[PDB]
Scaffold this active site. Structure first.
Site, mmCIF file in Angstrom:
data_model
loop_
_atom_site.group_PDB
_atom_site.id
_atom_site.type_symbol
_atom_site.label_atom_id
_atom_site.label_comp_id
_atom_site.label_asym_id
_atom_site.label_seq_id
_atom_site.Cartn_x
_atom_site.Cartn_y
_atom_site.Cartn_z
ATOM 1 N N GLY A 220 23.008 -8.933 7.550
ATOM 2 C CA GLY A 220 22.230 -8.032 6.708
ATOM 3 C C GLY A 220 23.054 -7.052 5.887
ATOM 4 O O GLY A 220 22.535 -6.495 4.924
ATOM 5 N N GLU B 45 22.142 3.890 4.084
ATOM 6 C CA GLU B 45 22.628 2.585 4.525
ATOM 7 C C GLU B 45 23.695 2.720 5.580
ATOM 8 O O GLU B 45 24.302 3.782 5.682
ATOM 9 C CB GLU B 45 23.185 1.788 3.337
ATOM 10 C CG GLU B 45 22.137 1.406 2.313
ATOM 11 C CD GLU B 45 20.907 0.759 2.900
ATOM 12 O OE1 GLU B 45 21.015 -0.267 3.609
ATOM 13 O OE2 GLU B 45 19.825 1.332 2.688
ATOM 14 N N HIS C 267 16.100 7.104 2.114
ATOM 15 C CA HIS C 267 14.881 6.465 1.665
ATOM 16 C C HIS C 267 14.021 6.006 2.847
ATOM 17 O O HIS C 267 14.504 5.844 3.955
ATOM 18 C CB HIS C 267 15.159 5.286 0.687
ATOM 19 C CG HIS C 267 16.161 4.323 1.205
ATOM 20 N ND1 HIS C 267 17.509 4.626 1.202
ATOM 21 C CD2 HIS C 267 15.985 3.105 1.747
ATOM 22 C CE1 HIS C 267 18.111 3.588 1.752
ATOM 23 N NE2 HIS C 267 17.236 2.648 2.092
HETATM 24 O O1 LIG Z 1 12.358 -3.249 5.587
HETATM 25 C C1 LIG Z 1 12.517 -2.842 4.442
HETATM 26 O O2 LIG Z 1 11.576 -2.877 3.542
HETATM 27 C C2 LIG Z 1 13.755 -2.117 4.042
HETATM 28 C C3 LIG Z 1 13.768 -1.305 2.915
HETATM 29 C C4 LIG Z 1 14.864 -0.498 2.697
HETATM 30 N N1 LIG Z 1 15.956 -0.492 3.476
HETATM 31 C C5 LIG Z 1 15.953 -1.310 4.542
HETATM 32 C C6 LIG Z 1 17.173 -1.295 5.364
HETATM 33 C C7 LIG Z 1 17.347 -1.755 6.679
HETATM 34 C C8 LIG Z 1 18.693 -1.664 6.920
HETATM 35 N N2 LIG Z 1 19.270 -1.193 5.809
HETATM 36 N N3 LIG Z 1 18.358 -0.954 4.838
HETATM 37 C C9 LIG Z 1 14.863 -2.107 4.886
HETATM 38 NI NI NI Z 2 17.710 0.862 3.249
#
Ligand SMILES: O=C(O)c1ccnc(-c2cc[nH]n2)c1
Ligand code: NI
Ligand SMILES: [Cl-]
Ligand SMILES: [Zn+2]
EC number: 1.14.11.66
Length: 350
Positions: A166, A186, A272
């Protein structure tokens, strides 16, 4: 630098096919426009661009580790607990997602759906087909291919052989209504790319990297137990905080809704969160620019958990900061990050 996007609002870009072709160059360009200041940006790809011919052959794809999302809390402050469920196909997932029990409620404006999300977050826990190893891009797609972006983050695998699922490999996310992604930056405070392949929208909340420390102080005050056990507890991705709570404690933030066929870019140290509107599929990975190296060096990491993502910065400092290598190894590199400054690669657009 502190003159472009002074409001630090989420910017939306509409590149031509010629602009879209060079990924790293287009990130450099949007940073020259101050897009990074919000911590989040939307990129609408050219109309004629498609990463796959059709999504009619993926119902038999397996979601090896579906996650039931149990949410506890009140007054806009919540903790999300993951309950791993048995493996299921996209077929079985789409059935449960579109069933009367788990489907999207009826609504007119987004503000109404947003209100229903924050009101019903703790009821009827949904299932998230998250962290699925794979890509939906066709092998021949050379523009913004999440499986091979060709940024400096490739120095991790190229030099050490280390693959981080990922992070330097793509993940697929099958969502349903009310599935959430908690407040976080992140891993290693990297960038991320998110493409919504198909389905219902994904709404996002973002805190400017300039105000990230303010969000951390707020979260630390609300969850003092968590902050005592791990400085970087937000990296556990369990903390949900409503926009009303942010507004109430003067934390600047912006919101955006991502539609199918759109990209979202998250920037280093950009906090976020958000949720899915209904059944959808998203693809994401991490990436770097030269500007990220300093963020990687200063990233506050999760102590308390085993298998937490930690990238060795040594190769980046040696290659891109040779004059600071000896100082950094001695723990004397006292560089302060200016969150407004764009990546050096943007010099041609400034
Ligand atoms: O599941 C989602 O929609 C999503 C959205 C933004 N960021 C992540 C994420 C998970 C690990 N790093 N970033 C996951
Ligand atoms: Ni993210
Ligand atoms: Cl934290
Ligand atoms: Zn931790």
């Amino acid at each position: 630098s502190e003159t472009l996007n002074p409001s630090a609002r989420i910017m939306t870009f509409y590149p031509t096919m010629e602009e879209f072709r060079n990924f790293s160059r287009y990130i450099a360009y949007i940073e020259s426009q101050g897009a990074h200041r919000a911590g989040l940006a939307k990129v609408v790809p050219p109309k004629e661009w498609k990463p796959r011919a059709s999504y009619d052959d993926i119902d038999d794809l397996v979601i090896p580790a579906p996650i039931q999302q149990l949410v506890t809390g009140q007054s806009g402050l919540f903790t999300q607990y993951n309950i791993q469920k048995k493996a299921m196909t996209v077929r079985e997932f789409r059935k449960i997602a579109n069933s009367d029990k788990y489907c999207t409620p009826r609504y007119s404006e987004f503000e109404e759906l947003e209100r229903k999300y924050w009101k019903n977050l703790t009821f009827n826990p949904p299932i998230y087909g998250a962290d699925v190893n794979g890509t939906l891009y066709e092998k021949h797609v050379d523009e913004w291919n999440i499986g091979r972006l060709r940024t400096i983050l490739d120095l991790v695998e190229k030099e050490s052989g280390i693959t981080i699922e990922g992070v330097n490999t793509p993940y697929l996310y099958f969502g349903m209504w009310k599935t959430s992604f908690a407040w976080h930056t992140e891993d290693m405070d990297l960038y991320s790319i998110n493409y919504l392949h198909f389905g219902e929208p994904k709404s996002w909340y973002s805190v400017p990297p300039e105000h990230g420390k303010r969000l951390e102080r707020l979260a630390k005050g609300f969850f003092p137990g968590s902050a005592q056990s791990c400085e970087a507890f937000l990296r556990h991705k369990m903390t949900l905080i409503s926009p009303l709570m942010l507004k109430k404690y003067g934390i600047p933030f912006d919101k955006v809704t991502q539609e199918a066929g759109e990209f979202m870019i998250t920037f280093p140290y950009g906090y976020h969160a958000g949720f899915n509107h209904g059944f959808n599929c998203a693809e994401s990975t991490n990436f770097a620019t030269r500007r990220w190296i300093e963020y990687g060096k200063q990233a506050v990491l999760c102590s308390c958990r085993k298998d937490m993502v930690k990238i060795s910065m040594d190769v980046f400092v040696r290659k891109f900061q040779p004059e600071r290598y000896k100082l950094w190894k001695a723990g004397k590199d006292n560089t302060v990050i200016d969150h407004t400054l764009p990546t050096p690669e943007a010099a041609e657009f400034l």
